[PDB]
Amino acid sequence: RECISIHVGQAGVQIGNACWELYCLEHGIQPDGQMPSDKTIGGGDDSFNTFFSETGAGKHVPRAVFVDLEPTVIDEVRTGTYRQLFHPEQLITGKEDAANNYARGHYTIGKEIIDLVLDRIRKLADQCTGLQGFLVFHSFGGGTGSGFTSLLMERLSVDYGKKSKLEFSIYPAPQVSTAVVEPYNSILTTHTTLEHSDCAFMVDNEAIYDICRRNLDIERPTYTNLNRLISQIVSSITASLRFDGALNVDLTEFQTNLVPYPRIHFPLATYAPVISAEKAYHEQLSVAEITNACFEPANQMVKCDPRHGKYMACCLLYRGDVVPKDVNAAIATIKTKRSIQFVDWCPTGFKVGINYQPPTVVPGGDLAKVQRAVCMLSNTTAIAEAWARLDHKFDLMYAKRAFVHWYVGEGMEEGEFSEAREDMAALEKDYEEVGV
Amino acid sequence: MREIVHIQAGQCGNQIGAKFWEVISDEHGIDPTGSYHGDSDLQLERINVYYNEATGNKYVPRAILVDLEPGTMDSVRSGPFGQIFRPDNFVFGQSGAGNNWAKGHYTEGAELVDSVLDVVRKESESCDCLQGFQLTHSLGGGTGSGMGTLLISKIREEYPDRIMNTFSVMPSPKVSDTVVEPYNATLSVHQLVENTDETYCIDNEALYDICFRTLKLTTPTYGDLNHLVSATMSGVTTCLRFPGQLNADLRKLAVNMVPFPRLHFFMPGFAPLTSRGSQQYRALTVPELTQQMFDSKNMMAACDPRHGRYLTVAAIFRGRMSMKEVDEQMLNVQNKNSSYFVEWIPNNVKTAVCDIPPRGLKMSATFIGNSTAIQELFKRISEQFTAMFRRKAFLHWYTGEGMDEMEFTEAESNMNDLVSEYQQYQDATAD
Amino acid sequence: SNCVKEVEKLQEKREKRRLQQQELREKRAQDVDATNPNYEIMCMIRD
Numbered sequence: 001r002e003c004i005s006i007h008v009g010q011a012g013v014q015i016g017n018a019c020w021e022l023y024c025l026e027h028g029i030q031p032d033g034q035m036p037s038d039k040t041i042g043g044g045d046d047s048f049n050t051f052f053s054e055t056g057a058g059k060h061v062p063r064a065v066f067v068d069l070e071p072t073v074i075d076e077v078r079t080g081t082y083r084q085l086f087h088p089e090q091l092i093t094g095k096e097d098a099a100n101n102y103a104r105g106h107y108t109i110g111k112e113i114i115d116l117v118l119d120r121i122r123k124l125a126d127q128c129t130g131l132q133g134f135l136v137f138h139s140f141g142g143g144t145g146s147g148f149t150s151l152l153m154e155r156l157s158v159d160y161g162k163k164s165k166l167e168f169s170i171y172p173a174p175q176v177s178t179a180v181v182e183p184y185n186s187i188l189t190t191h192t193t194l195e196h197s198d199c200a201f202m203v204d205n206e207a208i209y210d211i212c213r214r215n216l217d218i219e220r221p222t223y224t225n226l227n228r229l230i231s232q233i234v235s236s237i238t239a240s241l242r243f244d245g246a247l248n249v250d251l252t253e254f255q256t257n258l259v260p261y262p263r264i265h266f267p268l269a270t271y272a273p274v275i276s277a278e279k280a281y282h283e284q285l286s287v288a289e290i291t292n293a294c295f296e297p298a299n300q301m302v303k304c305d306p307r308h309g310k311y312m313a314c315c316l317l318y319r320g321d322v323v324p325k326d327v328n329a330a331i332a333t334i335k336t337k338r339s340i341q342f343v344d345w346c347p348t349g350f351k352v353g354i355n356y357q358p359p360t361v362v363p364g365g366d367l368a369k370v371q372r373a374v375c376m377l378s379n380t381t382a383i384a385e386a387w388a389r390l391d392h393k394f395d396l397m398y399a400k401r402a403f404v405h406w407y408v409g410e411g412m413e414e415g416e417f418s419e420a421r422e423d424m425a426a427l428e429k430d431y432e433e434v435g436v
Numbered sequence: 437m438r439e440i441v442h443i444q445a446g447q448c449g450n451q452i453g454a455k456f457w458e459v460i461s462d463e464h465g466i467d468p469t470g471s472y473h474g475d476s477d478l479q480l481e482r483i484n485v486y487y488n489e490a491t492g493n494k495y496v497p498r499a500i501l502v503d504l505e506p507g508t509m510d511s512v513r514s515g516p517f518g519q520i521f522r523p524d525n526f527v528f529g530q531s532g533a534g535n536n537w538a539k540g541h542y543t544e545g546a547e548l549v550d551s552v553l554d555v556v557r558k559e560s561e562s563c564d565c566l567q568g569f570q571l572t573h574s575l576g577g578g579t580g581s582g583m584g585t586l587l588i589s590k591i592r593e594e595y596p597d598r599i600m601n602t603f604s605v606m607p608s609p610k611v612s613d614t615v616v617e618p619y620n621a622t623l624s625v626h627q628l629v630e631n632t633d634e635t636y637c638i639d640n641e642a643l644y645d646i647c648f649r650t651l652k653l654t655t656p657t658y659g660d661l662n663h664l665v666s667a668t669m670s671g672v673t674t675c676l677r678f679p680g681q682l683n684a685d686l687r688k689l690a691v692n693m694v695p696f697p698r699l700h701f702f703m704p705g706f707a708p709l710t711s712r713g714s715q716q717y718r719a720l721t722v723p724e725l726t727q728q729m730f731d732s733k734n735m736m737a738a739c740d741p742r743h744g745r746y747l748t749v750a751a752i753f754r755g756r757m758s759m760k761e762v763d764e765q766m767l768n769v770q771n772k773n774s775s776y777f778v779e780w781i782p783n784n785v786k787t788a789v790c791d792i793p794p795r796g797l798k799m800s801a802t803f804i805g806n807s808t809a810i811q812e813l814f815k816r817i818s819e820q821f822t823a824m825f826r827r828k829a830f831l832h833w834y835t836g837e838g839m840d841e842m843e844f845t846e847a848e849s850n851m852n853d854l855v856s857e858y859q860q861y862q863d864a865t866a867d
Numbered sequence: 868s869n870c871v872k873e874v875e876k877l878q879e880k881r882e883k884r885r886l887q888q889q890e891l892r893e894k895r896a897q898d899v900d901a902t903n904p905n906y907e908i909m910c911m912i913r914d
């Protein structure tokens with residue numbers, strides 16, 4: 001029943017910080033771990049105890065451990081306004097970073113710390129009276145996030161066979177990009193993670209950039225900005241596991257509702273309404289309007305056009321103040337008005353769920369304490385645009401095998417590229433076959 | 437990733453090293469005694485990179501001064517900041533060098549290198565997480581080039597899990613201390629190719645150009661060039677010396693700027709071209725900065741980039757300015773001359789911004805470039821060299837010190853090969 | 868799977884070959900009678 005989250009690399013760790021902050025603000029948990037309602041210094045049975053394990057002092061410690069081959073970030077964790085929440089054993093800090101090198105994270109510096117990482121997963125996997133599975137955060141470009149994540153997934157389908165494991169990834173935006181070899185890692189950490197993953201959402205940082213610059217009016221978005229957005233995006237896909245909800249309550253249920261085939265487990269996610277805390281502030285939006293915004297590329301998380309593309313599965317999670325029959329009406333209007341072409345062998349009906357609680361946000365944050373909100377989880381073939389903007393940013397470089405010698409120098413054969421390319425070509429091919 | 441251990445060798449290398457420590461010591465806010473007096477915290481966010489932390493609120497340059505001349509260290513100590521250096525980090529011999537590489541790398545130099553290594557190890561044991569080693573030397577002399585390459589070999593073999601970084605300076609026929617500068621340079625390059633991860637090529641001839649023509653200094657003294665060197669070095673190390681995601685450490689910067697094992701020879705670029713102690717009647721804009729720092733007149737190597745295509749570029753703007761203006765102007769420079777950039781490396785032109793500008797300058801633009809134009813340097817040497825190596829002239833001054841005639845042909849060949857490599861990767865396409 | 872590199876590979880392989888045609892002399896410029904300041908002159912006479 002209880003799930004365990006895990007954070008890899010700079011991006012992963014920061015994202016984790018924000019996400020657990022939001023979880024606490026929604027449940028009503030204080031920064032030192034307490035809760036007004038609660039259940040007498042440790043009950044372990046509530047809806048929100050699928051993620052929190054309570055202590056004799058009533059300290060709702062999150063079921064999570066943090067990892068970085070670089071202490072600079074996780075130290076910002078044990079120094080932040082929440083230094084009293086976790087336990088230092090949930091914080092693993094290496095020495096030399098992977099330096100944006102996948103081979104340094106899987107092979108060299110990874111093997112020198114994986115045993116301690118498993119060692120720290122264990123103590124919190126024992127308190128699991130019934131373990132559903134894992135949730136993992138990382139990046140596509142960063143060295144730690146690309147390498148050590150693949151190492152942990154390999155050594156996670158081992159030590160825990162198959163229960164469930166769900167992924168969250170950060171797609172490279174040449175905007176806030178810092179490395180030239182961000183495609184390389186990004187491809188490898190996919191070729192060596194496609195199988196161990198049950199489900200996997202993506203995040204095009206270029207889309208988060210486009211959205212904070214279009215709908216939030218931050219000309220120069222810093223990292224804390226983009227992250228503050230991606231948190232409130234995630235906390236709607238996962239709000240169903242922490243509360244007594246209707247849809248998406250098991251980790252494998254995602255594989256059911258969203259995944260018809262395990263190779264293709266990359267759902268386009270879309271969140272509405274994205275509105276600033278000082279912007280517009282006119283009349284609030286209806287349910288039909290936020291449902292309509294679920295099909296605008298300006299609100300999709302990956303820069304892709306689902307128009308010129310087929311759908312496969314499509315869910316919609318609502319929260320706030322929503323009426324059922326209203327949602328039904330919007331569903332019909334979209335079903336008829338659009339050319340939303342679904343492939344033939346899938347249930348084109350749209351499963352939906354609600355949580356009757358106000359979507360709390362960061363007090364004083366860059367977003368609005370909105371009233372009603374919707375998040376579409378639609379796996380679509382058009383997401384195959386994303387890989388095309390990497391393989392093209394890949395074949396230009398493997399056709400001059402530049403920057404390759406660094407991987408060779410840190411323990412990896414040149415044939416791992418020759419197989420990691422063909423693998424991706426195969427996945428893209430599958431994304432073509434689903435349509436015709 | 438944290439500390440950088442610094443070394444300077446030879447007459448030139450020790451002079452320009454002294455000036456560099458003056459520069460960054462003034463930027464971060466350090467006095468000739470060693471106390472901190474600055475008025476900004478950003479100066480001390482990453483101060484350990486180039487400074488040992490000593491008791492008494494002091495700061496000691498984690499540096500190591502090496503020569504075989506006696507008098508150079510004398511010119512250091514009685515120099516301005518000569519009080520701050522931990523005296524045990526002075527290491528120097530009494531023989532000299534005579535602008536003789538072989539002397540520096542096999543004989544009189546080899547009788548001091550272990551003693552250098554013990555001080556290096558004393559600074560590396562008090563380290564926590566050592567990044568790599570930054571080196572400055574002359575390539576036309578005997579001390580810095582020979583003993584320098586020796587040190588590079590033994591240090592990169594003692595810790596091969598760290599970074600090796602060099603700031604080498606060229607022989608100039610327009611300066612010319614001797615007439616075996618081509619030989620010294622040739623061998624030193626032969627080492628630097630297989631030994632170092634990064635090499636910032638300062639061309640002495642190019643600096644004579646920028647002094648005599650752009651700055652109009654008709655009799656360029658050595659310090660005149662050492663100002664341009666000091667500015668260049670202060671600029672390129674901005675990424676390492678201040679908070680910045682881009683090029684945070686040596687390994688990152690090297691991985692972003694080096695796509696091929698051998699080719700790690702960078703053309704630096706500074707703007708605006710500033711004399712010593714001169715006023716700025718109208719400090720440059722942002723378009724003027726970006727326009728000059730890619731222009732050939734601002735290049736530290738005596739080469740034309742209008743002849744060679746960049747593989748990667750690390751641009752650094754110092755001084756507060758409009759970031760949007762920066763991004764736009766950089767896009768301008770990139771896609772107006774896209775027939776001068778490789779397209780098979782996407783987004784290869786990275787850019788970081790600093791806030792504390794250089795000394796006196798309101799805004800500056802520091803540019804690092806992995807260019808296939810740098811071969812115009814090598815092909816100079818590899819010609820200068822060949823002209824003398826054909827009838828084996830001046831060979832007795834090295835073979836007489838105990839070398840092998842084949843050690844030269846391995847060098848000339850390896851260099852002609854590096855040039856063929858550069859042209860090879862220049863003629864690259866998108867097929 | 869590109870070209871241009873290929874013309875660079877043709878280089879990289881030859882440089883090693885040159886290295887062995889030097890690391891041959893050295894450990895083969897040793898062996899039994901292989902010294903005295905006239906070593907070059909002796910090897911001349913012997914050849």
Ligand SMILES: Nc1nc2c(ncn2[C@@H]2O[C@H](COP(=O)(O)OP(=O)(O)OP(=O)(O)O)[C@@H](O)[C@H]2O)c(=O)[nH]1
Nearest residue numbers: 009010011097098099100139141142143144145223
């Ligand atoms: N959304 C978001 N993305 C980030 C952030 N920081 C870095 N990234 C992205 O992540 C990629 C780099 O990965 P990082 O996580 O920063 O690197 P790392 O995993 O710590 O690996 P090392 O730096 O070698 O230790 C880049 O493509 C960035 O676009 C962040 O704060 N928020």
Ligand SMILES: Nc1nc2c(ncn2[C@@H]2O[C@H](COP(=O)(O)OP(=O)(O)O)[C@@H](O)[C@H]2O)c(=O)[nH]1
Nearest residue numbers: 446447448533574576577578579580611658661
């Ligand atoms: N920029 C600069 N170059 C120098 C200086 N002194 C010498 N050089 C150059 O460096 C070479 C001489 O090397 P040097 O350091 O004097 O010999 P060493 O003492 O044996 O290392 C010549 O090619 C000179 O052109 C100097 O003060 N500044």
Ligand SMILES: [Mg+2]
Nearest residue numbers: 009010070097
């Ligand atoms: Mg990192």
Ligand SMILES: [Mg+2]
Nearest residue numbers: 447505533579
């Ligand atoms: Mg000297």
